[PDB]
C-alpha cells in the first residue's frame, strides 16, 4: 500500500470517476460500525480496485463522502457529511492525496457537487436546502441560494456554459439556473407534476437538453427549448440514483438504481444492456476514456465492476 494510504477502504463505495488518461478516482464512506468516515483512492490500474494495496494513492477524510468530482486532472472536490466542501489535490508524483481546502459553509450534509465549465467554479447542494457557488482559487462562496424548500438531491453544471447548472429537490422542483439573471433560477419540467426528481445529466453535445430520473424509477428526456417532456421510460423498480452519458458521438446513457441494477439506454431511451452484477445499491458509473465500450460501476456491496456494452 502507498505512503499515507489507509490499510482498509470503507465498505460503501459512493463515487467512481475516470480521468482523461484512464486513471480511476474512488470515493467511499463508512455508513455503519464504530467510525463513520470516508476515503479518496487513485487506481492507475483500474482492474486492481477496490484492493487497497494495489492503489496509486489513498487518503482518509474526517467524515463520509456524499459526492465527488474531478477538478481537471489533479483536483478532487468533495461533498462531506460534515457540511464542508473540501478541495483535495493530487501529488506531483501523484503518490499521495493532500487537502487543499475544507470549508464548513453548509449547515447540514453536503449532498451534491458539480464543477462549472470554467473549472474555477463549482456548485454545492445540501440537505440544508441551500445551493452555493464556489470560487475554487480564492476558496470562498460567491453566492448562496435558498431557491428550494426541501433537501437538494442533485446539482449538475452545464457542459459549456459557466453560468448555467440544473438542481433538483424533494420540493418536487427541477431548477434551471443562470447566474447572469437577477432572478437566477427558473422552474422547468414535465406537463404533469409527478414523482420527486432524483438524478440529472445534461446531454454532452446538445446544450439545451437534459435527462432526469425520479424516485419511481422513470428516466425522462427534457428539451428546455420545448420546456415539454419529450420521452420517458420506466427503467427501474426503484429510485434512479444516477445518470451518465457515454463519450460516444451519439452518446449511450447509463442508468443506476437502488434496485441494484444498471441499464444502458439509446438516445430514444430504449434499453440495450442490463447488469444484475451488484447485490446492493449501485452508486456511480464512469465510461473509460481509453475504451468507450467499457463502463465501471461501484456499489455498497464494495464491488468495482467493469462492463463491456454491446
Amino acid at each position: 500500500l502507498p505512503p499515507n494510504a489507509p490499510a482498509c477502504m470503507e465498505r460503501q463505495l459512493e463515487a467512481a470517476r475516470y480521468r482523461s488518461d484512464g486513471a480511476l478516482l474512488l470515493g467511499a464512506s463508512s455508513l455503519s460500525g464504530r467510525c463513520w468516515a470516508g476515503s479518496l483512492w487513485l487506481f492507475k490500474d483500474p482492474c486492481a480496485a477496490p484492493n487497497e494495496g494495489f492503489c496509486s494513492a489513498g487518503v482518509q477524510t474526517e467524515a463520509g463522502v456524499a459526492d465527488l468530482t474531478w477538478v481537471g486532472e489533479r483536483g478532487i472536490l468533495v461533498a462531506s457529511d460534515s457540511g464542508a466542501v473540501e478541495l483535495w489535490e493530487l501529488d506531483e508524483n501523484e503518490t499521495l492525496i493532500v487537502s487543499k481546502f475544507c470549508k464548513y459553509e453548509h449547515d447540514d450534509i453536503v449532498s451534491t457537487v458539480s464543477v462549472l465549465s470554467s473549472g474555477t467554479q463549482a456548485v454545492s447542494g445540501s440537505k440544508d436546502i441551500c445551493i452555493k457557488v464556489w470560487d475554487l482559487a480564492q476558496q470562498v462562496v460567491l453566492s448562496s441560494y435558498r431557491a428550494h424548500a426541501a433537501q437538494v438531491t442533485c446539482v449538475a453544471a452545464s457542459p459549456h456554459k459557466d453560468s448555467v447548472f440544473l438542481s433538483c429537490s424533494e420540493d418536487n422542483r427541477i431548477l434551471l439556473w443562470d447566474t447572469r439573471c437577477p432572478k437566477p433560477a427558473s422552474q422547468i419540467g414535465c406537463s404533469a407534476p409527478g414523482y420527486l426528481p432524483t438524478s440529472l445529466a445534461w446531454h454532452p453535445q446538445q446544450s439545451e437538453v437534459f435527462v432526469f430520473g425520479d424516485e419511481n424509477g422513470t428516466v425522462s428526456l427534457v428539451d428546455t427549448k420545448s420546456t415539454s417532456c419529450v420521452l420517458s421510460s420506466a427503467v427501474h423498480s426503484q429510485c434512479v440514483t444516477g445518470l451518465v452519458f457515454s463519450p460516444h458521438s451519439v452518446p449511450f446513457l447509463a442508468s443506476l438504481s437502488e434496485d441494484c441494477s444498471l441499464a444502458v439506454l439509446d438516445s430514444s431511451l430504449s434499453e440495450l444492456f442490463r447488469s444484475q452484477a451488484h447485490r446492493d445499491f449501485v452508486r456511480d458509473a464512469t465510461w473509460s476514456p481509453l475504451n468507450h465500450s467499457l463502463l465501471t460501476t461501484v456499489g455498497w456491496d464494495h464491488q468495482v465492476v467493469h462492463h463491456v456494452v454491446p
Partner: protein, 625 residues
Amino acid sequence: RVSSGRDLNCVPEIADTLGAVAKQGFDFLCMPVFHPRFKREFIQEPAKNRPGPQTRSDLLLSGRDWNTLIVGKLSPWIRPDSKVEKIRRNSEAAMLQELNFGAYLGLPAFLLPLNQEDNTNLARVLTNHIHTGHHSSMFWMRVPLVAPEDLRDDIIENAPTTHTEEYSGEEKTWMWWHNFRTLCDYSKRIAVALEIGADLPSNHVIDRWLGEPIKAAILPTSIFLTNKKGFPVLSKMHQRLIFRLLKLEVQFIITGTNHHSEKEFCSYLQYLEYLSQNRPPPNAYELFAKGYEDYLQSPLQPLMDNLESQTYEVFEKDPIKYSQYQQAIYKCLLDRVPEEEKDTNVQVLMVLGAGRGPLVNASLRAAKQADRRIKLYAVEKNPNAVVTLENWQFEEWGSQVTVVSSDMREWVAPEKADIIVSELLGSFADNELSPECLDGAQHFLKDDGVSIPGEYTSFLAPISSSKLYNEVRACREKDRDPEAQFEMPYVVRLHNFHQLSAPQPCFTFSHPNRDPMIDNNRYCTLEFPVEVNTVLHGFAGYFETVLYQDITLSIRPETHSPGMFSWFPILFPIKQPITVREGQTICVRFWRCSNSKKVWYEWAVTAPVCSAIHNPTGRSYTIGL
C-alpha cells in the same frame, strides 16, 4: 440558568463528538442513531440481505450517557407519507427500527420532523410505537415557526413568492402540529421542538404556540448577527422571543456550522447564558409560584372540611392582605364612632371564620390605630383552630376577645354586631360558600351593621392550553365517571396558556343581603370576542372583593392586589377542545346551583359551537353546606 444541546447530522466517532460538545458546555447531543445516508431495504432482494451491523454498538457509551446525554434523530430519508408505495413501506419499517433502537438505548428523547402538511402515516407509526410497552421517553416534533416554502429566497423568475399577506396561511405550521398531535390523541410523550428562523413571522404566528407543549427551541447559527468584536448576537425581536421561551423553561438546541469562525462555538452558548442572566428578574409572586406552574390542585372547602395547621400558616404568610383588612376596619370604625363618642362608644366586632386569629389581630391593630373601642367575638367551627385561638386569647388577647367554637349559621349570639369581618372567599370568590355562611349570620348584625367584605365578584376568561387540557385528562380515576376530571374546577398557577379574551364579571354577592326573598343561585351568559385563531380548552376564574369603600383585594390580573401571591386562579375545563376562528365570539353559560346539602357550578359553551353541560346536578363536583 440555561439547559442547552448541540444538534449534529455528522458523528464520525460518538466518543470524540460527545466529548467535544461537553468541552463546549452543551448539556446533551442530538444525533442520528443510524447514519443519515445509510438507506435500508426491507422487502426487495438483494439489498434486503445487506450484511450488518445496521448501526454502531450500544457498548460505545455508558447506559447513563444514553439515558441523559443523547437525543436521537429520525433519518431524513424516512418518508412514511411518501406517495411512492415502496418508499412508504421501507420508511414505515425504518422508522419502527430507529424508534425501537432509541428505546433499546433508553434515550430520554427522540426528534421527528413535521416538515409538510400530511404526516398522517408518520403519526400512525409513532402511535404504534407509543402503544408498544409503556415508556417515559419524549418525542420532540421538529416544526418551524415558518414553513421552508414561505422562507425561500425570491429568486425563481417564473415562481415569484406571494407578497400577499394570508393570516391563516402564515399559521400553517401550527396546523401541521395540531393535526399530528390530534391523530396521536394528545399523547403526553409528544411535545414540540420549535425551530426559529432568521425572519420571525407576525406576532399572531408566534402567539399561535402560546399554550403548546414546547420542550425545545432550535436556534440555527444562521439567525445570529455579529457584534463589532465579531461575537454572535441576536436581533431584539429574536431576544424578546428567547425571554418568552425562558419563562417556559425550554431546552435550547444550537444547529448548523460555526458561522463566527473567528471564534469558538461556545460563543453561541455564551450569548444565551448572557441573555438568561440579563433577563428582568421575577417578582415575589413569581418566586412564590416557583414549583406550582400548571400544577392542578383541589379547591379548599374550609366549610365542609377542617383546614390543617400549615394551610392556615400559608393564609397568614401574606401580611399585605391583612394590612388591607386592618385599613378597612380602621376606616369603618372612624365612620361609626365620632371623636366625641370615642370613649363612650365600644363597637361589637365579630370575626366569622377566625381561623388562627390574623383578622382578630388586624381588628385589634385597627382599633388602637383608630383610637376607638371594640369588643371582639372570634367565631370558628374548626375545633383544631379553636385550640390556637383559645391559647392566644388566654395568653394575649384576654377577655376583650370571646372565642366562639360554633358554625356562624347555628350560633345564638349574646348581642348584635356593628361589624362582621370574614375571609370566606376562594379563587372564584363564592366557591367556599361565603354567601350561605354570611346569610346565616346576618340575623345577628345590627340594622346599620357593616359586613367586611361588603361585596365580591367572580370573573371568567376563555383560555387556550393544550398542556393543561392534557394535565386534566390525565386525572382519570378508577371507581368514578371516566370524564369527572373535566367536570370540576382546579386551583392552578396557570403558566403555559393563552388568555383568549379580557376577563368578564360572572357572579356578584353583597353583604348584608337586603333581599326580602334571597336566592344565591345564579345563571350568567358571557360573550368573549376572540381576535385570533385558537383552541378553547377551559375558563380561568378570578375574583375581586370590596373589603370597605376603596379598600379591595383582587387576583384579576388587570386589578391584581399587590403581594397577593397567596392565591392562584381557578380553571373550569371542558371535555372537548373547541376550535375558534379569529373574529368569532365564545359564548359560555355558568350556573351556581344549590340544595340544602350542596352548592355546585354547571357550565356550557353555546358558541361558536355547543358543549355538553358540565357537572349536571353536581354529579362530578359539589361544595358541602
